[PDB]
Amino acid sequence: TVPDALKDRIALKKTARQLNIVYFLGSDTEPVPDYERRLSELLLYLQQFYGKEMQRHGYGARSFGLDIKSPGRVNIIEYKAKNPAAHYPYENGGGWKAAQELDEFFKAHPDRKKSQHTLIIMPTWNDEKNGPDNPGGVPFYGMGRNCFALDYPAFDIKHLGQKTREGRLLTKWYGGMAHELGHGLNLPHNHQTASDGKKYGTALMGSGNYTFGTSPTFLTPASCALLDACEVFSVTPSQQFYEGKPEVEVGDVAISFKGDQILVSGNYKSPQTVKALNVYIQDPPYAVNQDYDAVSFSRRLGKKSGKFSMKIDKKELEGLNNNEFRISLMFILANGLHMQKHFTFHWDALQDYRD
Numbered sequence: 001t002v003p004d005a006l007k008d009r010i011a012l013k014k015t016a017r018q019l020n021i022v023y024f025l026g027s028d029t030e031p032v033p034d035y036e037r038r039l040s041e042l043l044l045y046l047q048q049f050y051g052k053e054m055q056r057h058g059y060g061a062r063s064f065g066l067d068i069k070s071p072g073r074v075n076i077i078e079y080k081a082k083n084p085a086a087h088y089p090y091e092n093g094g095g096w097k098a099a100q101e102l103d104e105f106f107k108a109h110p111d112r113k114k115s116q117h118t119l120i121i122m123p124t125w126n127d128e129k130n131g132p133d134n135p136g137g138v139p140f141y142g143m144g145r146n147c148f149a150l151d152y153p154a155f156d157i158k159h160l161g162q163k164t165r166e167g168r169l170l171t172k173w174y175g176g177m178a179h180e181l182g183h184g185l186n187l188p189h190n191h192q193t194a195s196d197g198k199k200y201g202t203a204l205m206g207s208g209n210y211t212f213g214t215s216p217t218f219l220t221p222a223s224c225a226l227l228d229a230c231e232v233f234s235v236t237p238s239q240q241f242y243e244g245k246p247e248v249e250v251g252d253v254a255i256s257f258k259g260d261q262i263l264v265s266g267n268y269k270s271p272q273t274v275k276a277l278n279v280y281i282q283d284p285p286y287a288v289n290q291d292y293d294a295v296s297f298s299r300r301l302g303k304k305s306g307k308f309s310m311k312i313d314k315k316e317l318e319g320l321n322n323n324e325f326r327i328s329l330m331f332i333l334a335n336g337l338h339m340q341k342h343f344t345f346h347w348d349a350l351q352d353y354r355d
């Protein structure tokens, strides 16, 4: 009743809001056997992974909330859809269709909604391409505060780390679920620093979907700073999330280059508390699936207005190899919204930036 991988687990702070878990079934789709137990186990270990990383970065034993209905069992919403599986494929807006339909279900059942974040899980298609040994066919990506992942018969934590085909399949699809969940929890892509790579392995939001459960995987300081401001990590029930717009005035921005150091400073002002500053440094190009290389850094602010100052060591920018690079400054607000300002430089014509 408790798998070995969960015998080592920490007590977590109760949260104000919980991630919804939906097991989403096409009108013609059969559940994968034993999914309540298998998925509860995988989700609780996932909750442990995020909570231990939050703790290791100084936030205490905080993870995303889950609605737990009895020991070791997540209260998973089993949703029978209006249409057959074919109507919600990986391609062509299948994920938007499922997610819009679940909105109707949550309007019709507000008691089942515990936050604005949902992980929708669909059983693998079984056809000439996909099946138990090669799952796929369904949405598998982040979509706003929602994210999509899949289930298949060997999707079972007992295979975690085993040097077998089931174990390798698990790291692929469990790492996959972990990464897409990161997106649903307001995480962008980021790459580990050089020192963090040697200490802790692969950033989950970089290439960690290939490593989770097999070699060391972790959450960066910047990832944890965003989770710190994510609705389902809240231990503060008075705090409302995602309403309105990010309002931050950033002024007196300076970025200067001195020897090996990158100096970043400025001031900020917001009607909300500004929790933190994340900095992303990356090579071009800069699109949303071309930023696995953005090496991130983070600093605690914690005021509605003030100054920020930060020295970044150039030698930590592991993997960057372009003459051209971009520094992004990300201001994270207490209600989970954020704003970004971007700056482009060239290493062979490095120009300090002012104003």
Ligand SMILES: *[C@H]1O[C@H](CO)[C@H](O)[C@H](O[C@@H]2O[C@H](CO)[C@H](O)[C@H](O)[C@H]2O)[C@H]1NC(C)=O
Pocket (backbone or CB within 6 Å): 090, 135, 136, 137, 138, 139, 140, 150, 172, 173, 175, 176, 177, 209, 210
């Ligand atoms: C990214 O890695 C994932 C595992 O970590 C996974 O392989 C994903 O691939 C998609 O999986 C979907 C599951 O329904 C579909 O089968 C889809 O066709 C397939 O590409 C990987 N993404 C990409 C873009 O390859």
Ligand SMILES: [Zn+2]
Pocket (backbone or CB within 6 Å): 179, 183, 189
């Ligand atoms: Zn991604």
Ligand SMILES: [Zn+2]
Pocket (backbone or CB within 6 Å): 282, 283, 284, 285, 286, 287, 290, 291, 292, 293, 294
């Ligand atoms: Zn890039």
